[PDB]
Amino acid sequence: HHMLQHLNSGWAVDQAIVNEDERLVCIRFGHDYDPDCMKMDELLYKVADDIKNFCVIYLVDITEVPDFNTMYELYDPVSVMFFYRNKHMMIDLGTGNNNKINWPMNNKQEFIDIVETIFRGARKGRGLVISPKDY
Ligand SMILES: [Cl-]
Ligand SMILES: [Cl-]
Ligand SMILES: [Cl-]
Ligand SMILES: [Cl-]
Prior knowledge:
The chain has 135 residues and is α/β, with parallel strands linked by helices.
């Protein structure tokens, strides 16, 4: 329990998470200039319209907005995290870090499937889902 829209303050992040009752909130916490972050953002732009009925994506440059860097141990240049009704959703991706997707993905359908799985689990009141695919 806590163009794509950038969030420019810890207040704005809090607000985006706490105010959304219907959809999964996807936050990309990153060092925006890093190539891995840029790679992940291309993917987010490609899938955003496909998932807009069940998921809203926000971008946060953690060099500018560092407020959650200890809270979520944000050491990586890209960490995609998911929230439903103010609850941080876990995703067992087979990597042994269930808190975040912290590598650039480049398969559009694979990511969409992960977002859908998280949403569907969240809607059942689950705090953790097993990714449709082992990573
Ligand atoms: Cl702001
Ligand atoms: Cl603030
Ligand atoms: Cl609803
Ligand atoms: Cl659960």
